[PDB]
Amino acid sequence: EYDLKRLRNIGIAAHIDAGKTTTTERILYYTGRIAAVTTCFWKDHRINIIDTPGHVDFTIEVERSMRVLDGAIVVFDSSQGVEPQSETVWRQAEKYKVPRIAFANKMDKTGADLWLVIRTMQERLGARPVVMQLPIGREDTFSGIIDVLRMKAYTYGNDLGTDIREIPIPEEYLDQAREYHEKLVEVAADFDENIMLKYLEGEEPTEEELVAAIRKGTIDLKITPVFLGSALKNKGVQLLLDAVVDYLPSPLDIPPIKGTTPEGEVVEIHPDPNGPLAALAFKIMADPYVGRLTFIRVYSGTLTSGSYVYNTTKGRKERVARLLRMHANHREEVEELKAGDLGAVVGLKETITGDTLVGEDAPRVILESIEVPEPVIDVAIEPKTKADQEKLSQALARLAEEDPTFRVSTHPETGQTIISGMGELHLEIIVDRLKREFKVDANVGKPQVAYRETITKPVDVEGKFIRLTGGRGQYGHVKIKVEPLPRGSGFEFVNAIVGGVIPKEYIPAVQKGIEEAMQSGPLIGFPVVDIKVTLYDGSYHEVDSSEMAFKIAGSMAIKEAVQKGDPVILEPIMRVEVTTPEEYMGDVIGDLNARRGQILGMEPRGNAQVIRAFVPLAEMFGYATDLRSKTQGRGSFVMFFDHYQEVPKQVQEKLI
Ligand SMILES: Nc1nc2c(ncn2[C@@H]2O[C@H](COP(=O)(O)OP(=O)(O)O)[C@@H](O)[C@H]2O)c(=O)[nH]1
Numbered sequence: 045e046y047d048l049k050r051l052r053n054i055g056i057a058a059h060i061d062a063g064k065t066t067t068t069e070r071i072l073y074y075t076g077r078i079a080a081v082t083t084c085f086w087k088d089h090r091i092n093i094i095d096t097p098g099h100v101d102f103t104i105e106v107e108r109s110m111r112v113l114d115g116a117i118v119v120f121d122s123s124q125g126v127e128p129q130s131e132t133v134w135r136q137a138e139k140y141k142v143p144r145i146a147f148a149n150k151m152d153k154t155g156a157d158l159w160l161v162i163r164t165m166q167e168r169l170g171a172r173p174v175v176m177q178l179p180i181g182r183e184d185t186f187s188g189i190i191d192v193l194r195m196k197a198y199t200y201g202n203d204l205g206t207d208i209r210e211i212p213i214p215e216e217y218l219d220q221a222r223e224y225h226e227k228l229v230e231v232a233a234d235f236d237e238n239i240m241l242k243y244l245e246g247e248e249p250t251e252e253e254l255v256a257a258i259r260k261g262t263i264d265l266k267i268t269p270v271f272l273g274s275a276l277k278n279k280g281v282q283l284l285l286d287a288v289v290d291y292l293p294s295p296l297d298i299p300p301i302k303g304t305t306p307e308g309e310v311v312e313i314h315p316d317p318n319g320p321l322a323a324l325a326f327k328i329m330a331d332p333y334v335g336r337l338t339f340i341r342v343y344s345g346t347l348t349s350g351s352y353v354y355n356t357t358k359g360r361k362e363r364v365a366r367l368l369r370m371h372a373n374h375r376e377e378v379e380e381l382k383a384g385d386l387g388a389v390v391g392l393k394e395t396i397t398g399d400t401l402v403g404e405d406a407p408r409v410i411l412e413s414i415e416v417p418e419p420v421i422d423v424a425i426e427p428k429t430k431a432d433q434e435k436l437s438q439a440l441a442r443l444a445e446e447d448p449t450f451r452v453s454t455h456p457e458t459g460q461t462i463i464s465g466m467g468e469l470h471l472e473i474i475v476d477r478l479k480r481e482f483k484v485d486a487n488v489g490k491p492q493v494a495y496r497e498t499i500t501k502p503v504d505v506e507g508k509f510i511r512l513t514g515g516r517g518q519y520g521h522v523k524i525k526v527e528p529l530p531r532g533s534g535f536e537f538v539n540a541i542v543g544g545v546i547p548k549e550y551i552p553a554v555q556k557g558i559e560e561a562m563q564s565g566p567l568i569g570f571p572v573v574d575i576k577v578t579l580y581d582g583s584y585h586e587v588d589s590s591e592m593a594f595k596i597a598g599s600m601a602i603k604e605a606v607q608k609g610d611p612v613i614l615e616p617i618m619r620v621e622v623t624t625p626e627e628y629m630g631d632v633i634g635d636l637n638a639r640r641g642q643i644l645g646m647e648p649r650g651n652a653q654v655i656r657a658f659v660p661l662a663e664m665f666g667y668a669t670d671l672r673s674k675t676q677g678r679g680s681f682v683m684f685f686d687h688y689q690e691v692p693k694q695v696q697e698k699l700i
């Protein structure tokens with residue numbers, strides 16, 4: 045019942061509106077006449093449908109899902125052909141090397157043009173599409189579908205998925221079918237030497253010979269077999285299913301994932317169900333009454349229900365309570381998920397997405413790399429009035445338990461609460477989750493960039509606090525040398541206090557006030573960083589001293605030192621990567637340069653080009669629409685944090 049050869053782990057890549065959801069749903073319908081991953085069945089194949097992100101830019105989720113699916117269906121709206129948006133979702137497939145087939149959807153829709161599609165695919169994407177199918181009918185007359193591989197035709201009696209008849213190819217479409225058949229063999233001839241031979245002599249190849257060669261080329265990323273239909277009026281879905289099993293890869297056809305032994309060495313992980321367990325956790329979902337569901341793909345070895353596993357990322361042993369397969373209609377409990385297969389593990393306390401599971405006494409290997417994102421975007425949230433402020437913090441602190449990659453700071457100047465994430469999009473869904481599904485209404489603020497403040501020469505300063513009746517006596521007096529630290533060494537404190545000069549009991553108070561003051565620098569009231577303070581002197585007033593006095597004396601001192609230390613602002617600098625059609629190389633580079641950018645070099649990927657760059661996060665507000673309207677919809681970028689830099693003198697004189 046389990047055969048790797050017969051797994052088909054796919055995802056459905058689709059443009060907004062192209063029909064992703066409707067295609068997926070109809071695929072579940074047809075496979076069901078018998079959720080992060082939904083399993084189903086087709087002619088003795090298990091298809092695991094990986095849910096891909098609902099818009100392309102979600103870059104992390106993207107990487108995580110493409111990694112876990114094997115093949116893919118790309119869906120096109122055959123009224124537009126390939127859109128700007130359809131182009132972006134192709135590049136992702138191209139980017140992550142995932143073997144693909146196309147689906148010309150919406151064939152019943154006015155403007156339905158198969159060839160509008162096929163051409164844009166060769167033309168704009170450099171795709172080498174192959175006509176696997178011919179349509180019978182046009183728009184509202186789109187009646188059926190011809191298969192030019194097997195030279196059989198299909199007709200659909202209704203929009204419902206209820207009437208299908210295998211017909212002979214109408215004589216009227218018989219010339220065109222014969223045309224695209226020999227072209228198909230012509231294509232398969234590039235992948236099978238004995239089909240070439242057979243081609244040359246006018247010998248018809250076997251139906252299998254032909255499928256195998258299409259498959260081989262689809263998988264090696266050399267061709268993109270193309271199919272069509274209407275998901276909405278149920279036409280051609282079964283054939284597309286058919287195609288998934290035909291041409292789309294099993295766990296075996298794609299090269300194996302790589303991971304790192306604990307000695308630092310990189311290994312290919314090979315899909316042996318009787319080899320060592322190794323598995324990636326790639327999504328957590330909090331099922332209502334089943335519990336906290338944690339979705340995995342198993343790369344090698346077997347995962348057995350009731351067993352104990354070792355989480356190698358968070359180095360702690362977990363226990364696998366139940367194993368589930370999520371179907372369309374129901375949940376199915378299973379004893380075991382073998383190499384190449386997928387599902388959900390129940391129980392599992394401290395495992396978050398990214399985490400690697402191995403089998404207790406198996407190699408302590410690590411599949412997914414490190415970097416936690418610097419929280420570079422801040423956002424303020426005035427609640428309602430103590431109203432939604434009630435449950436927001438309660439919902440924040442469990443939401444911080446399937447995302448460790450975002451800060452929560454209470455801003456102590458004006459008062460609001462501060463969430464700090466990595467991207468604008470990061471903060472936007474965290475906001476839709478706040479308001480929609482955890483019922484928090486509030487004044488959500490505008491995305492401000494996480495600026496910092498530091499000094500550029502050493503200082504030698506003092507702070508005092510001195511009260512006399514108001515209403516008892518107060519005294520605190522320190523002296524500090526503050527010097528610059530290297531970029532991102534952060535805070536260092538040193539106590540060069542002699543002996544009794546400041547009584548040992550007050551040093552904490554000094555440190556507290558120093559830290560307290562460093563949360564608001566003098567330039568733009570942002571956090572102070574990368575400095576080394578040394579308390580070297582001071583004084584005290586013998587009755588009148590106190591923790592309060594020394595604390596303030598430290599705030600004071602610290603704030604003064606920053607004003608004096610030729611202070612400067614630090615801003616986040618992003619590593620940006622722009623995917624442009626080659627015709628816009630120049631006009632896109634100039635814009636980047638115009639955002640104080642600095643180019644690192646364009647390597648081509650596909651028939652596209654990919655420009656690398658450094659650009660201040662501050663200048664990236666609305667790059668998405670700027671690119672779109674400078675590549676004509678066809679551009680797409682990815683940003684990742686790199687480092688902090690001094691702002692130019694111009695920008696400081698501006699931010700204040
Ligand atoms: N005419 C037509 N409309 C379709 C077809 N497939 C999907 N749609 C429509 O496209 C709209 C959005 O579809 P959806 O699957 O949500 O697209 P998505 O945003 O890319 O996920 C819906 O109104 C669907 O009814 C099709 O084959 N023909």
Ligand SMILES: [Mg+2]
Pocket residue numbers: 064065098
């Ligand atoms: Mg959708």
